[PDB]
Every structure is written in structure tokens, then in C-alpha cells.
Amino acid sequence: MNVTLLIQELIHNLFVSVMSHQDDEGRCYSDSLAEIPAVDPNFPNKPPLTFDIIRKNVENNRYRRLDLFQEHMFEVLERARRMNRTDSEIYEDAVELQQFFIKIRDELCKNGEILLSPALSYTTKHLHNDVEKERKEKLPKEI
Ligand SMILES: [Zn+2]
């Protein structure tokens, strides 16, 4: 559909950037998250959400707020982290994508003079702290 908001353009740019992010061998990180189930059986009441579902919303300009877009993206990435071992490709790709998401989010918001968004309350430092805590929790279970 038709972009009527700066934030829709920003969200599209952010989504494409994150989905296209590649490792040093040109492997797309998002590829390993293609088969993540839409519903974690441990949390069966959360609405189905996948990158395919978020894409459809992004392309049809359905996100009019950064915080909702970030919430959905973080649901998927956090599910991939929860459901997989710290030594796995999926886990590590999910963390990398989440870190990259924050980096590009911040850059686009600076460029667009987006200051107020509640999405910006969750910083790179918060993500580092939260990932480090999860790694520590998970370690003994992976022995
Ligand atoms: Zn597009």
C-alpha cells in the first residue's frame, strides 16, 4: 500500500536491513530463523508471529508505531533464543539480529529526529545484560 508516514518508511528500512544482515561469508542470519514455529508450545496463548507475518504487516504499512513493530520482532527473536541452546546457530543468529536491530533502529531514529518513541527505552546495554543473564541461566542445562 501507500506510505503516509515517515515512521512507515523507517520501519520498512529497518525490517529490510535486519532481514538482509549477513555474516562475513555472506550468509543471511535471518535464514536460520525461517523454521521457528509461530507458537512456542510452552506459551500457547501468544498470537502466532513469525517474520513472514511481520513482513506482510510491514509491506502493507500496518505498523504506525515503532514500539509495536519492535515488540513483534522481539517476540520472534526472543522465542528463537528461548527455544534453542546457547551453542546453536539459531540462538547466536537471533542474538546477532537483535543487536543489529537496535543498532540500525538507533541510527534511523537519529537521522529522522525520532526521539520520543518508547521503543528507545530498550538499549544495547539492556540487551547485553538480558542476553548475558539468559546464557548464564541456560549453561548448566546444556551440560
Ligand atoms: Zn519492501
Residue numbers in the entry: 740 to 882
How is this structure described in the published paper?
Bromodomains (BRDs) are protein interaction modules that specifically recognize ε-N-lysine acetylation motifs, a key event in the reading process of epigenetic marks. Despite large sequence variations, all BRD modules share a conserved fold that comprises a left-handed bundle of four α helices (αZ, αA, αB, αC), linked by loop regions of variable length (ZA and BC loops), which line the Kac binding site and determine binding specificity.
The C and N termini are highly diverse and may comprise additional helices that extend the canonical BRD fold (e.g., the sixth BRD of PB1 has an additional C-terminal helix) or largely extended kinked helices that are present as C- or N-terminal extensions (for instance in TAF1L or ATAD2). The most notable structural difference within the BRD core fold is a hairpin insertion located between helix αZ and the ZA loop that is present in all family VIII members. The proximity to the Kac binding site suggests that this insert may play a role in recruitment of acetylated binding partners. In contrast, the second, fourth, fifth, and sixth BRD of PB1, MLL, and TRIM28 interacted with only a few histone Kac peptides.
